[PDB]
Amino acid sequence: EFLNNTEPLCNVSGFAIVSKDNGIRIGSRGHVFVIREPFVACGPTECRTFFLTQGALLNDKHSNNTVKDRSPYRALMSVPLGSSPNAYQAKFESVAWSATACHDGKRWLAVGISGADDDAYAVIHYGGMPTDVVRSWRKQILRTQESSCVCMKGNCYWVMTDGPANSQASYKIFKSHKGMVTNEREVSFQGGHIEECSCYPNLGKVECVCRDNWNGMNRPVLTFDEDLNYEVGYLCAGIPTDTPRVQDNSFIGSCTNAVGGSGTNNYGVKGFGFRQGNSVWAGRTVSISSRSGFEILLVEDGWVKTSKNVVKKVEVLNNKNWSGYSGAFTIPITMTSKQCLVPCFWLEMIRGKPEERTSIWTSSSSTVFCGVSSEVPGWSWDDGAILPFDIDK
Amino acid sequence: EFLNNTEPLCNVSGFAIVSKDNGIRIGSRGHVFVIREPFVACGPTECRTFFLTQGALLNDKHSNNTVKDRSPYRALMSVPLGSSPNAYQAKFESVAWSATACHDGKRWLAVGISGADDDAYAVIHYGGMPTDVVRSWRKQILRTQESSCVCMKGNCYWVMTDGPANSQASYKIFKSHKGMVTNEREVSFQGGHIEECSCYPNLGKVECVCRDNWNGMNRPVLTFDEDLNYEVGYLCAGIPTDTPRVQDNSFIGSCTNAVGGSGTNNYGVKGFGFRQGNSVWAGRTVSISSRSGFEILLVEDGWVKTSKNVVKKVEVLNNKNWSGYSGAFTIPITMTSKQCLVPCFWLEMIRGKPEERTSIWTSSSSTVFCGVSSEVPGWSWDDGAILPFDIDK
Amino acid sequence: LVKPSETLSLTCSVSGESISSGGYYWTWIRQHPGKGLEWIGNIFDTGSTHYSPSLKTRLTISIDTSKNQFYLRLNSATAADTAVYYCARVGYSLETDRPYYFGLDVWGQGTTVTVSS
Amino acid sequence: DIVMTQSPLSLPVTPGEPASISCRSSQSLLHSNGYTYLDWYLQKPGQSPQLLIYLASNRASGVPDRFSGSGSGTYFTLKISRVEAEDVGVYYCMQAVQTPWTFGQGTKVEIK
Ligand SMILES: *[C@@H]1O[C@H](CO)[C@@H](O[C@@H]2O[C@H](CO)[C@@H](O[C@@H]3O[C@H](CO)[C@@H](O)[C@H](O)[C@@H]3O)[C@H](O)[C@H]2NC(C)=O)[C@H](O)[C@H]1NC(C)=O
Ligand SMILES: *[C@@H]1O[C@H](CO)[C@@H](O[C@@H]2O[C@H](CO)[C@@H](O[C@@H]3O[C@H](CO)[C@@H](O)[C@H](O)[C@@H]3O)[C@H](O)[C@H]2NC(C)=O)[C@H](O)[C@H]1NC(C)=O
Ligand SMILES: *[C@@H]1O[C@H](CO)[C@@H](O)[C@H](O)[C@H]1NC(C)=O
Ligand SMILES: *[C@@H]1O[C@H](CO)[C@@H](O)[C@H](O)[C@H]1NC(C)=O
Ligand SMILES: [Ca+2]
Ligand SMILES: [Ca+2]
């Protein structure tokens, strides 16, 4: 039977670590794929770590120039939560260079975007097969949210964007039932940019905290429900949470207007935020100009009242370790026996040519946390790889 | 309960990619079998990629001289769709250097030909054990279709040939129930050659588009039903689709006669074609004298009226990448919930000594596509291996 | 026509599309008689500019989003500056995590400039 | 700047036959972000240039299916599978790696 999610999000006080891949550390000798961005989705029986393999193994000579992030070789694979992305346990899901997956209660749905830059299209797998295809409409890079989709009452939703990166794009909300699409509406959000949302369900309303890549230090917010009626805005919090940002004491914040800054207009990073009443568990990097470190801030009334009062702070990566994307997902009732959904989030750690020049490859390692009612301290659970690898020499 | 297939083939407008092995690219460091020709068959629960391993791993020194395509070490193995042919997921199916497999609803049937050249015979596995043996009758190389067999109402069919390669052979149609053979009729096709058919069911009639190796540029057609009454002919299409062929404007075509050409008489390549009313989705290589590139042509009335009007064209490999065999298979109702069968086709990409002289080995990588009602663009999903490998140095 | 040592000015217009739509970089390209092409500079919808080093001291390029026009100014024009001038659009970006580039997909008709008395 | 050179100055061709043009650059055009920024442009008599190939291999929209491209590092190649009467013109290669974009010398295609 289909998986319900019309139940409220759980109030949590601190996040406790759940699993850690050790993907790069083991990969020095073991056969492990080269990943760029992973994410986690939970079905009724088990949670699985999806990732976009680059078609080559670490230390393999095919890892040359893996910084290239769109190629015909990329594929979305799947491994049970915690296990390294090794070559012999990874179940194949779809071909893609941008994807999303979620479990609707019966079988996995997975969306995989492929094709040329200007003529991309998306293939919607359901249970192992393609059932439908969605083509671009503005004929630029088509993109999905790089994290789990949200399924409620058997219908799974996700957000796609097509258009320029550093300028106003066209965003659409999709709705599907048993693989094939059934509804589609466009977001008329003139003043901002919504690229790489992270979504979770909350009492029948899908909420997404997204990435602003155009004249914005602030997280966009999208809220929609069964029949795709939506509200669009910005995370009111007075504490900025995008990677390029001015220090907290200089920022002002706004609920509806985008807020630019000094050199922070044309860049950003995927993030997440959980609403708790009117507060928000906004996650952000420690550094204000680079993807390093990571924090979780519980901002009182940060969802609606431009507040700056940080009630609680937790650090999971100290400032000297590289970080990356971060996304949200929820563990459903069928797996907890709770009467509410337990929030969780995942955090990747990039290592490679983008910041470590000498290496020829680029991979990342995933870490997963979940909320806990009891308060929990933090620690620097860094990846711990030791570069350069044998192939870089 | 046995798997029905007495339902019509589904009308499709374009083929969307489903999976890609990345076998060779991963094999540079991972432990992967050396393949020569793969194919795909779909059961009620999952689809699987079969392949005739050569009994050695890539980069292993045993890969010496793997061009030899019949030796006492080949074996038909099986992997779930999309996963690379690695050494540790691979289930073992049968010993063979020529094989076919299909799922009849209860358990996998698999046929494996083995033995010396002049006294070969076939073993019919059913559910992991042998039940019956079929011996040669003209005492030359015995061959099965190198692609999935067609099962209807529990009876599985396949085509075998024995005799010369460049001259008139003897062809037979087999029918089996729960492993053991029950019926057998010979095809009295005097004017042509039918070697390596690709078959799919269509509303109770098994249809096969085969390979002509003797005075033929044109695809032979075989149609038979429950009790093995058959009709034999040629694909009427005015567009030739065998590898050696004259350009389309010089060809004329015929429904019943073989059509030779200038130097195109004693060679060919396995291919496929799906009937859509009176049109055909004939697949063919891009080049007219080599196995490179790949196209899919929807020829209006090409099945019966010698037409040349190409309504739609799709390219999946540009002319600069090597290609190879191609075969058909259908995803049944049990796995789609549709009231019709969804056509699909697979395309291998050979790399090795046959055209790249310096390498000592020979392997191929599989790519799978499936039909979609919506129109879909094409792209060059090439294998992307980087030869020579470490063992060729 | 332009006399030597004067200041050259040119105008280019956009229609169908609107400046600040699609996030394109607008480019000026030059072609001397009998020679190959040469690249002058770029302007983004928001006014950020790039110049070719050899002409950086003479050039000035700007936009007027209300008129859907962008302009080229070249000071101290020499006789050698005689050439055909094209204006084109090119949409590309290098910051984001999904870069793209569609080089110079649209060109306007050339304008012949002769620097002589 | 990237010094760009082009192999044939003039390429005699005839309809129906394959044809090839090549370019070499003084520095590898493999940008740090992994993409290879090189294009090919075609200028027919009495017209402003047109876009053929906008990266090492990608064809532009509307271009005839007869064109192709390949190459990496410093050496690149444009391939015409079947030359036709409409292909007469001057072919320029371009690179978009560095701040100053530079074009090639220009290979003229003359039918024979
Ligand atoms: C792929 O990774 C390999 C290393 O695994 C890199 O190989 C290097 O490629 C460069 C050219 O891109 C070679 O440089 C050339 O070498 C010779 C002297 O050996 C000389 O004629 C030239 O001046 C030029 O420098 C280099 O030798 C080669 N190997 C090493 C160890 O540096 C390669 O650059 C990476 N990228 C690609 C696209 O293959
Ligand atoms: C199998 O693959 C191996 C390489 O992995 C090939 O080995 C080569 O075998 C040839 C003979 O077939 C050797 O050539 C002979 O070598 C000596 C000098 O070393 C000389 O006495 C002879 O004139 C003759 O050339 C060759 O050295 C050997 N190794 C290499 C690196 O080429 C082998 O040919 C492949 N085939 C078989 C059937 O094993
Ligand atoms: C889903 O929600 C409906 C409506 O509240 C309820 O009747 C049904 O039992 C729920 N199903 C499950 C599996 O929890
Ligand atoms: C197979 O076909 C028969 C005859 O049409 C039908 O009665 C039966 O229900 C079918 N079985 C399945 C499993 O679809
Ligand atoms: Ca930003
Ligand atoms: Ca033939």
PDB file of C-alpha atoms in Angstrom, chain B residues 21-116:
ATOM      1  CA  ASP B  21      27.150  -0.947 -18.715  1.00  0.00           C
ATOM      2  CA  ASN B  22      30.368   1.084 -18.664  1.00  0.00           C
ATOM      3  CA  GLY B  23      31.904  -2.379 -18.682  1.00  0.00           C
ATOM      4  CA  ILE B  24      35.206  -1.589 -20.372  1.00  0.00           C
ATOM      5  CA  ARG B  25      35.639   1.786 -18.684  1.00  0.00           C
ATOM      6  CA  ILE B  26      35.199   0.263 -15.228  1.00  0.00           C
ATOM      7  CA  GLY B  27      37.189  -2.814 -16.221  1.00  0.00           C
ATOM      8  CA  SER B  28      40.464  -0.890 -16.368  1.00  0.00           C
ATOM      9  CA  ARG B  29      40.853  -1.581 -12.641  1.00  0.00           C
ATOM     10  CA  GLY B  30      37.754  -3.502 -11.630  1.00  0.00           C
ATOM     11  CA  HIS B  31      37.468  -7.246 -12.127  1.00  0.00           C
ATOM     12  CA  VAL B  32      35.223  -7.601 -15.176  1.00  0.00           C
ATOM     13  CA  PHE B  33      34.662 -10.441 -17.624  1.00  0.00           C
ATOM     14  CA  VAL B  34      35.805 -10.206 -21.230  1.00  0.00           C
ATOM     15  CA  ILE B  35      32.624 -10.364 -23.309  1.00  0.00           C
ATOM     16  CA  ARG B  36      32.040 -10.666 -27.036  1.00  0.00           C
ATOM     17  CA  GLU B  37      28.275 -10.362 -27.524  1.00  0.00           C
ATOM     18  CA  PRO B  38      25.690  -9.503 -24.845  1.00  0.00           C
ATOM     19  CA  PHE B  39      21.894  -9.455 -24.949  1.00  0.00           C
ATOM     20  CA  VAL B  40      18.995  -8.699 -22.619  1.00  0.00           C
ATOM     21  CA  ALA B  41      15.956 -10.706 -21.536  1.00  0.00           C
ATOM     22  CA  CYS B  42      13.160  -9.621 -19.204  1.00  0.00           C
ATOM     23  CA  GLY B  43      11.361 -11.747 -16.643  1.00  0.00           C
ATOM     24  CA  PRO B  44       8.266 -10.785 -14.656  1.00  0.00           C
ATOM     25  CA  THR B  45      10.311  -9.245 -11.825  1.00  0.00           C
ATOM     26  CA  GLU B  46      13.506  -7.867 -13.366  1.00  0.00           C
ATOM     27  CA  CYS B  47      15.450  -7.662 -16.613  1.00  0.00           C
ATOM     28  CA  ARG B  48      18.913  -9.210 -16.849  1.00  0.00           C
ATOM     29  CA  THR B  49      21.930  -8.758 -19.115  1.00  0.00           C
ATOM     30  CA  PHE B  50      23.229 -12.108 -20.353  1.00  0.00           C
ATOM     31  CA  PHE B  51      26.646 -12.365 -21.935  1.00  0.00           C
ATOM     32  CA  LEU B  52      29.050 -15.002 -23.232  1.00  0.00           C
ATOM     33  CA  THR B  53      32.136 -14.574 -21.086  1.00  0.00           C
ATOM     34  CA  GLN B  54      35.469 -15.684 -22.512  1.00  0.00           C
ATOM     35  CA  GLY B  55      36.690 -17.078 -19.208  1.00  0.00           C
ATOM     36  CA  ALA B  56      39.173 -14.304 -18.439  1.00  0.00           C
ATOM     37  CA  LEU B  57      39.220 -10.847 -16.895  1.00  0.00           C
ATOM     38  CA  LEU B  58      40.271  -7.621 -18.549  1.00  0.00           C
ATOM     39  CA  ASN B  59      43.982  -6.859 -18.096  1.00  0.00           C
ATOM     40  CA  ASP B  60      44.518 -10.552 -17.275  1.00  0.00           C
ATOM     41  CA  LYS B  61      47.173 -12.223 -19.403  1.00  0.00           C
ATOM     42  CA  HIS B  62      44.672 -14.988 -20.189  1.00  0.00           C
ATOM     43  CA  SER B  63      42.932 -12.421 -22.412  1.00  0.00           C
ATOM     44  CA  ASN B  64      45.585 -13.206 -25.038  1.00  0.00           C
ATOM     45  CA  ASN B  65      43.949 -13.954 -28.373  1.00  0.00           C
ATOM     46  CA  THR B  66      40.354 -13.551 -27.199  1.00  0.00           C
ATOM     47  CA  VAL B  67      39.395 -12.883 -30.821  1.00  0.00           C
ATOM     48  CA  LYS B  68      38.950 -16.653 -31.022  1.00  0.00           C
ATOM     49  CA  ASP B  69      35.177 -16.846 -30.740  1.00  0.00           C
ATOM     50  CA  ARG B  70      34.795 -20.589 -30.064  1.00  0.00           C
ATOM     51  CA  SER B  71      36.922 -22.315 -27.431  1.00  0.00           C
ATOM     52  CA  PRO B  72      36.268 -24.620 -24.465  1.00  0.00           C
ATOM     53  CA  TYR B  73      36.125 -21.835 -21.870  1.00  0.00           C
ATOM     54  CA  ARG B  74      33.149 -19.659 -22.863  1.00  0.00           C
ATOM     55  CA  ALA B  75      30.146 -19.527 -20.567  1.00  0.00           C
ATOM     56  CA  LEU B  76      26.787 -17.774 -20.537  1.00  0.00           C
ATOM     57  CA  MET B  77      26.567 -15.676 -17.363  1.00  0.00           C
ATOM     58  CA  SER B  78      23.919 -13.286 -16.077  1.00  0.00           C
ATOM     59  CA  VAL B  79      23.820  -9.942 -14.257  1.00  0.00           C
ATOM     60  CA  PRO B  80      20.879  -7.630 -13.404  1.00  0.00           C
ATOM     61  CA  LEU B  81      20.218  -4.922 -15.983  1.00  0.00           C
ATOM     62  CA  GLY B  82      22.722  -2.078 -15.880  1.00  0.00           C
ATOM     63  CA  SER B  83      25.343  -3.533 -13.559  1.00  0.00           C
ATOM     64  CA  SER B  84      28.737  -4.081 -15.134  1.00  0.00           C
ATOM     65  CA  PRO B  85      29.718  -7.678 -15.966  1.00  0.00           C
ATOM     66  CA  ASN B  86      31.922  -7.940 -12.871  1.00  0.00           C
ATOM     67  CA  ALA B  87      33.373 -11.183 -11.506  1.00  0.00           C
ATOM     68  CA  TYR B  88      31.361 -11.327  -8.268  1.00  0.00           C
ATOM     69  CA  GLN B  89      27.738 -10.472  -9.027  1.00  0.00           C
ATOM     70  CA  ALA B  90      27.695 -12.729 -12.088  1.00  0.00           C
ATOM     71  CA  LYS B  91      25.364 -15.695 -11.781  1.00  0.00           C
ATOM     72  CA  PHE B  92      26.322 -18.738 -13.832  1.00  0.00           C
ATOM     73  CA  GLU B  93      23.752 -19.965 -16.367  1.00  0.00           C
ATOM     74  CA  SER B  94      25.315 -22.493 -18.744  1.00  0.00           C
ATOM     75  CA  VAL B  95      28.369 -23.444 -20.753  1.00  0.00           C
ATOM     76  CA  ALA B  96      28.148 -22.218 -24.344  1.00  0.00           C
ATOM     77  CA  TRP B  97      29.695 -20.300 -27.189  1.00  0.00           C
ATOM     78  CA  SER B  98      26.227 -19.587 -28.628  1.00  0.00           C
ATOM     79  CA  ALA B  99      23.147 -19.171 -26.494  1.00  0.00           C
ATOM     80  CA  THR B 100      19.671 -17.770 -25.994  1.00  0.00           C
ATOM     81  CA  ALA B 101      17.602 -17.180 -22.881  1.00  0.00           C
ATOM     82  CA  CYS B 102      14.097 -16.122 -21.923  1.00  0.00           C
ATOM     83  CA  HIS B 103      11.710 -16.225 -18.974  1.00  0.00           C
ATOM     84  CA  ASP B 104       8.504 -18.216 -19.464  1.00  0.00           C
ATOM     85  CA  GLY B 105       6.868 -16.983 -16.232  1.00  0.00           C
ATOM     86  CA  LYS B 106       8.103 -19.681 -13.842  1.00  0.00           C
ATOM     87  CA  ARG B 107      11.884 -19.929 -14.323  1.00  0.00           C
ATOM     88  CA  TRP B 108      14.629 -18.968 -16.760  1.00  0.00           C
ATOM     89  CA  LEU B 109      15.167 -21.161 -19.807  1.00  0.00           C
ATOM     90  CA  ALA B 110      18.649 -21.003 -21.307  1.00  0.00           C
ATOM     91  CA  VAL B 111      20.152 -22.827 -24.294  1.00  0.00           C
ATOM     92  CA  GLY B 112      23.892 -23.359 -24.526  1.00  0.00           C
ATOM     93  CA  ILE B 113      25.688 -24.779 -27.559  1.00  0.00           C
ATOM     94  CA  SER B 114      29.070 -26.397 -26.967  1.00  0.00           C
ATOM     95  CA  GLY B 115      31.429 -28.998 -28.384  1.00  0.00           C
ATOM     96  CA  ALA B 116      33.823 -29.349 -31.271  1.00  0.00           C
TER      97      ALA B 116
END
